[PDB]
Amino acid sequence: PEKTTFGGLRDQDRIFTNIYGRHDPYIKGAEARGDWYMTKDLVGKGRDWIIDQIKKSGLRGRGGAGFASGLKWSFMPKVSDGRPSYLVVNGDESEPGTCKDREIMRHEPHKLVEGCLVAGTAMGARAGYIYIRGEFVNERKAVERAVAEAYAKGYLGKNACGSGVDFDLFVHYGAGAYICGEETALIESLEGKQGKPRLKPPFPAGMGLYGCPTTVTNVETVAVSPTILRRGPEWFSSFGRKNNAGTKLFAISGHVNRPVTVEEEMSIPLRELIERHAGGVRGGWDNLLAIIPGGSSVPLLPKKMCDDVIMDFDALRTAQSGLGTAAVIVMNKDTDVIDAIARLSYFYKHESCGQCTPCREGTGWLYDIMSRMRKGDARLEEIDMLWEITKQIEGHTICALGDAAAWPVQGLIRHFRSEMEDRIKNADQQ
Amino acid sequence: IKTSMNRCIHCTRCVRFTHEVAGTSELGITGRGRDSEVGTYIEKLHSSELSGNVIDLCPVGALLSKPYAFTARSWELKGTETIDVSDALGSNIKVDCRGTEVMRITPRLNDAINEEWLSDKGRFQYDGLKRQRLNTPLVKGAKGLENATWSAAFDAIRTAIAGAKGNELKAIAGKLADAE
Ligand SMILES: Cc1cc2nc3c(=O)[nH]c(=O)nc-3n(C[C@H](O)[C@H](O)[C@H](O)COP(=O)(O)O)c2cc1C
Numbered sequence: 001p002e003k004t005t006f007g008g009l010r011d012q013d014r015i016f017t018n019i020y021g022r023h024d025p026y027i028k029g030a031e032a033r034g035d036w037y038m039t040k041d042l043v044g045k046g047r048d049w050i051i052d053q054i055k056k057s058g059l060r061g062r063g064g065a066g067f068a069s070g071l072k073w074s075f076m077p078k079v080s081d082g083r084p085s086y087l088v089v090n091g092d093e094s095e096p097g098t099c100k101d102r103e104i105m106r107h108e109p110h111k112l113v114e115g116c117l118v119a120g121t122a123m124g125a126r127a128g129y130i131y132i133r134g135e136f137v138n139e140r141k142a143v144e145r146a147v148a149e150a151y152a153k154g155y156l157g158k159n160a161c162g163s164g165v166d167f168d169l170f171v172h173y174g175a176g177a178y179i180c181g182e183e184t185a186l187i188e189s190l191e192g193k194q195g196k197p198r199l200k201p202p203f204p205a206g207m208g209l210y211g212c213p214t215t216v217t218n219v220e221t222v223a224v225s226p227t228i229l230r231r232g233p234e235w236f237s238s239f240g241r242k243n244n245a246g247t248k249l250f251a252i253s254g255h256v257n258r259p260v261t262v263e264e265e266m267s268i269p270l271r272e273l274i275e276r277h278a279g280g281v282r283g284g285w286d287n288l289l290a291i292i293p294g295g296s297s298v299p300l301l302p303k304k305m306c307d308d309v310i311m312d313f314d315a316l317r318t319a320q321s322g323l324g325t326a327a328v329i330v331m332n333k334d335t336d337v338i339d340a341i342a343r344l345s346y347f348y349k350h351e352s353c354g355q356c357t358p359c360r361e362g363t364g365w366l367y368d369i370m371s372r373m374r375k376g377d378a379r380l381e382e383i384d385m386l387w388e389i390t391k392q393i394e395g396h397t398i399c400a401l402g403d404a405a406a407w408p409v410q411g412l413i414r415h416f417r418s419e420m421e422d423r424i425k426n427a428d429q430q
Numbered sequence: 431i432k433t434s435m436n437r438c439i440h441c442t443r444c445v446r447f448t449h450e451v452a453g454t455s456e457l458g459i460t461g462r463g464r465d466s467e468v469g470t471y472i473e474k475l476h477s478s479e480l481s482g483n484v485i486d487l488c489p490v491g492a493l494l495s496k497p498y499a500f501t502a503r504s505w506e507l508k509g510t511e512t513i514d515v516s517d518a519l520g521s522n523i524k525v526d527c528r529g530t531e532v533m534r535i536t537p538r539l540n541d542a543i544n545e546e547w548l549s550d551k552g553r554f555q556y557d558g559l560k561r562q563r564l565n566t567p568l569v570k571g572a573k574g575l576e577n578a579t580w581s582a583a584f585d586a587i588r589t590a591i592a593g594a595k596g597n598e599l600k601a602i603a604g605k606l607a608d609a610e
């Protein structure tokens with residue numbers, strides 16, 4: 001937590017404690033680990049107190065947005081106009097580099113349920129829905145068992161936890177779509193239609209599920225909120241830098257000696273994280289072509305930038321990338337960056353719902369151009385054309401999947417244009 | 431309705447019409463991404479009597495009029511603004527003609543009566559304006575109805591009316607008779 005240096009989080013400061021499933025993930029272990037401790041008091045203190053404590057903690061939103069959780073929760077209506085309020089937890093964790101949410105769902109189900117209770121009381125939501133990926137059948141079974149147990153002991157329902165508050169929780173599951181993770185597209189999917197995002201000028205706080213005020217929040221934010229109210233906002237604020245306070249779950253994947261999911265305070269150096277928790281890059285730090293810091297949506301960073309880069313939101317924004325999800329992917333010198341970015345382009349071409357013209361057409365265009373560049377078929381001007389097309393897509397789409405499709409290609413153009421030019425010229429030469 | 435779905439830009443005008451206005455709820459966007467397609471998932475035929483309006487609503491010719499297929503181009507047609515006698519709504523229409531032939535009938539905007547919609551019968555009944563037409567006066571003889579001039583037909587009607595008197599003369603007006 002020291003302002004000069006950040007890293008080396010201790011076990012006493014870790015929110016997610018059975019993340020590795022060495023203990024019983026169900027209610028007996030949850031109670032023995034400190035779950036559902038004094039939820040009666042925290043809920044009874046009123047929605048306003050919870051909102052102010054979350055605001056003071058500085059908890060920004062996990063899941064990619066980074067928007068302050070307290071302000072988003074405070075956008076919820078205070079008094080009913082005849083429309084109930086709903087809490088939907090976005091447990092859809094589709095992202096090519098992110099695996100972190102699955103461990104929370106399968107090994108800490110009760111922290112998530114208790115957090116849903118706390119947040120629904122903070123926002124005055126009568127009912128709650130936990131959206132889960134359809135592929136996560138076993139994780140859904142774990143969450144459903146947690147919900148049933150909480151209902152059995154009276155933690156949920158009317159007079160939940162003994163306080164004069166009423167909250168009902170349901171578990172809903174999709175059928176597989178990356179787009180269904182977006183806030184409006186998730187609402188459309190849960191209503192029963194195609195998971196196509198809704199234009200934002202109507203906002204979900206104003207009009208959401210069944211036309212009623214709703215808030216969509218990630219499992220990780222919902223899970224961390226109750227312990228934030230228990231441990232204290234100052235404790236949560238201490239770890240990170242200014243405006244970037246909390247600890248976050250880092251999922252290291254790719255060419256590392258040990259791929260691990262770990263919890264660490266934000267503003268750790270990326271080199272320190274990779275070397276301590278991941279065991280170092282396969283073949284040493286010297287053997288780095290590039291690292292994708294925040295899952296596939298954000299632009300990649302070359303080794304040189306990865307040397308001094310710090311694992312934070314605003315700093316990665318300064319480094320022309322972003323910490324969407326703490327899903328860091330490491331590539332060796334052996335790796336072909338072109339093929340991986342082409343696979344990401346195919347991913348986005350496959351995951352576009354097709355609603356708006358720019359995404360529906362430009363993502364397939366991007367995939368085709370990247371496929372030709374993967375073999376060297378293209379010309380040297382094709383790179384400039386590719387940059388122009390990425391600029392055409394960005395900002396002109398309904399949701400951010402167009403931006404998430406454009407960004408990796410832009411990062412490839414920006415940092416590894418030399419390798420693309422080499423591949424294009426050599427194929428013509430040979 | 432003729433379909434060339436390859437020309438389809440994925441607006442949702444046809445789907446929105448079929449749901450909100452026509453109310454048969456037959457068309458939808460089946461698919462995801464670029465290979466998303468418009469149409470009935472099963473082999474179904476559009477049942478509404480307002481089915482013709484999707485052709486006008488379609489901006490890019492993916493939905494087109496099968497009766498009016500490959501017969502003329504837009505610049506070739508002279509449009510005259512008239513009304514539809516198909517029913518008592520009196521839908522305001524624009525009849526497009528090349529030479530002496532009516533080529534197609536399309537609606538006009540009149541919020542008072544027909545917002546901009548036309549029924550299929552009114553839209554596609556111009557086909558029956560070329561068939562079984564009466565061109566000349568006919569007077570009956572032992573050989574049947576035969577060609578006659580206007581004077582001869584009027585003479586026969588005069589000889590017939592001379593016999594009849596008072597209420598023996600009877601008039602029956604049709605569905606398409608005009609006020610004059
Ligand atoms: C194409 C697309 C896919 C997304 N997928 C997810 C996802 O799988 N999980 C998630 O938490 N957010 C996802 N998001 C971000 C959503 O906006 C998310 O519901 C919202 O940011 C959650 O807010 P929070 O930070 O308070 O949790 C996605 C956004 C887009 C545009």
Ligand code: SF4
Pocket residue numbers: 179196197351352353354355356357359360397398399400401402
């Ligand atoms: S950007 Fe892509 S995924 Fe988002 S609404 Fe448009 S077509 Fe659908």
Ligand code: SF4
Pocket residue numbers: 437438439440441442443444445468487488489490491492493
């Ligand atoms: S109105 Fe025409 S262009 Fe639009 S979806 Fe229907 S067929 Fe396609």
